[PDB]
Paper text:
This study describes the 3.0 Å crystal structure of Mtb BfrB. The molecular weight of BfrB being ∼20,000 Da, the Matthews constant (Vm) of 2.9 Å3/Da with solvent content of 57%, suggested 24 molecules of the protein in the asymmetric unit, corresponding to an entire 432 symmetric octahedron. The conserved region of each BfrB subunit is composed of the A-helix (H12 to S38), B-helix (P42 to D68), BC loop (R69 to R87), C-helix (P88 to D115), D-helix (F119 to R148) and E-helix (L153 to E163). In the present crystal structure of Mtb BfrB the metal site is not occupied, but the overall structure of the site is nearly identical to that of all the illustrated homologues. E54 in Mtb BfrB has a flipped orientation that is stabilized by formation of a salt bridge with R180 (unique to mycobacterium species) suggesting an altered C-site in Mtb BfrB. Multiple sequence alignment revealed the presence of an extended C-terminal region comprising of 18 residues in mycobacterial ferritins. Although uncertainty existed in the side chain conformation of the Cflexible region (the proximal region of the stretch), the electron density for the Crigid (the distal region) left no ambiguity in the structural definition of this expanse.
Ferritins are ancient proteins that store iron away from the delicate machinery of the cell to be released again in a controlled fashion at the time of need. The iron storage mechanism involves binding of ferrous iron to ferritin protein followed by migration to the ferroxidase catalytic site where ferrous iron [Fe(II)] is oxidized to the ferric [Fe(III)] state.
Numbering used by the authors:
A (entry chain R), B (entry chain U), C (entry chain J), D (entry chain B), E (entry chain E), F (entry chain M): 10 to 163, 174 to 181
């Protein structure tokens, strides 16, 4: 039952990651190379997370499946609104991850519970950063050059990390 | 109109790549580390291909979209059957790529035509290899150890290559 | 009371470790150098675990005792059966470790609870590996050479690590 | 509400840290360079802990405040009595940290819960050492030279460490 | 009597230093990493000053005490107002230091008088800098990016420096 | 028949080694790091000896078994009494080893006789040292600091040494 929720999380993460590529590609086309570079990177790290969940099920000889990925959002009024979706998403992932921890606790699946511990910390950091990008984006008017300057200056995964 | 077909190919490639992860994870769970390591790699290179198509539309200031990904196959009777799907898939991708070339030629889109040239050559090699893995898999009975030994011994993409 | 269960675990781990030596020496006599080398190593790492528990009680100025060790199994019908005992044992250790975590949680011993967290993760990996050795051993008939090739290719502790 | 208790802990830790400086300065004046050097260091590491708490609230975009610091003890009958206060203090900090863990658990604040995990382990070690200094101090009569010989021989922080 | 005033200065300096941390943490939460980094550093150097005074009393075998620290200001309307408090504070510290020099002169405490000489020079520089940060902050509108770029581009102490 | 006595010696040595861990852990808890460090090491070297015996039977294709280990002593009135047990133990091991040599001589087992030769020499040295630690321990009153200063200043094994 925590197993079923973990599978679903693999799906969520693959989706989340795809959404990042979409966001990265959006920035790339808006000639925001720095933001783009970052979210290209961000998408890869999210893929890593997925593969870490895959790996956990593998290690526990539980059934695992590589899911499809939902359509993701490709059109944005402006860079800030994209950064917003990214923060909003990371906040959601944090919820999902919290819930997994809860379920594992309830089922007294101690292995699952500790395995989620790292993810919780990672989420604190991902949210912290998306939040910062949004604030700084707000501070920079349609002066995206400022946003771009700012970005420029400031468990085992199945397959490897990349 | 070649533009539309190129978008659809971005979707195909992201799908194809996902299917590789599925195959990789399958091998990984069957304790076939060498096969698995390879297809994990294979899936990343396919992702690269997708991103190369993304990059092409970017460079031409044509609309581009990061698609969702179809469900992919996760269960196989045996390693050979998975290798089969991979060959079968790469053959299909070759078709799609040929068809893109044809459409570009027909529309006299000389930029699109030349951009596809590299992909044609890549497909020759990808198919050549999947084909080899299938033959060798056939030669090795249920003696997968032999298959494993064998594997062990023998354009700008948006984001970068991995 | 979690203290009592921790002492007992020190005993279990020393025992587990001894059983590995036994398994290692069995392989060694069967002219399975690779398997043997690994389980000699495996036994040392288990000893390390014991000493990590010793160290925890030391750091908490709680009474600790170096136990004796129960007789362990020395005769096996065949390599596979040995690897089996090893998996079976690591599964048991995981139980013990989970139960410790539970007891500490119940007693609201927050120090004990966190200290166990590492051990949970380690067990996920030890089990994952013994399981893999068993599957591969199954795949290899009485063709132990294949088993051997495969193995060849693929908290603070009191007194330190080894 | 765990947030409130966390703020209060930042205050506690700054206080604790200051008390160490006091202890270090005491030793310094007693011409106990080794003990002094150590507690100067100890005070810095405590400051680090405070800044790690500051950093956690920062990362979670929760309100954080740099508190004042209570008067700390400056006069001691003799080195042993200072070392005593230090052990007694570290034991108290351990309580506070446990309590935080408890509250986070109760409120099901999974992020706070995991973030506290490191601090629990650190406290095991700080207490272990203060306890050792007291025992050895006891063993050394007013023969402080022996105490001195002994000492000589044997999460992100807002700002950095030092 | 200069001794009494020196003790009080130890208190002032510890307080001043704490106020810097507050200012640093404020900037940090406003996503002004450069300003923050600098004032984190600034707070450490102020701590150093305190410890230098501690050391002076130590060297003269005069009674010294590690004081508590007053509450410091944590909320600011905007970065400029914080920089203001910082300048204002350093000017005050300069007064205190001057007054110490005066008292020592009056008491004909030649040792205290010379020991203060270094602190006078340091204050000239600290004030010079806080003043510069304020002017530049004025010049930069709510364009804090400019303030940030600017900062980015442009005796013995008890325990040691840090 | 010398073969039976050799097996029993493997048991003795594993026991002896465990007893050293006990002694090491005792010292560790008494805050005698140097003594502890040494006997941790000493226990490993004893384990080595056991494994050297295992190796001899392995090399001679004689049946060998990894034994359990008897309870060992964990409580001591004071450091000297522990050092005593250690000397007393090594003297006992020397007897056992002599007796093995004798039996091999009687049975005219020339291979066993020579293999024992090294162990005789090693015992001369182990006893020589335990004896020295006892004398020095006697010389040092309850002044253990002196004991500690002193310690600080002054065949194939199945699986390898440590």
């Amino acid at each position: 039952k925590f197993h079923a929720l973990m599978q679903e999380q693999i799906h969520n993460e693959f989706t989340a990651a795809q959404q990042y590529v979409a966001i990265a590609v959006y920035f790339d086309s808006e000639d925001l190379p720095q933001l783009a570079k970052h979210f290209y990177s961000q998408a890869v790290e999210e893929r890593n997370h997925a593969m870490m969940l895959v790996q956990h099920l593998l290690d526990r000889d539980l059934r695992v499946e590589i899911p499809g990925v939902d359509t993701v959002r490709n059109q944005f009024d402006r860079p800030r609104e994209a950064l917003a979706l990214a923060l909003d998403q990371e906040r959601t992932v944090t919820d999902q991850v919290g819930r997994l921890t809860a379920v594992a606790r309830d089922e007294g699946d101690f292995l699952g519970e500790q395995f989620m511990q790292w993810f919780l910390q990672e989420q604190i950091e991902e949210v912290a950063l998306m939040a910062t990008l949004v604030r700084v984006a707000d501070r920079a008017g349609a002066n995206l050059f400022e946003l771009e300057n700012f970005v420029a200056r400031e468990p085992h995964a199945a397959g490897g990390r990349l």
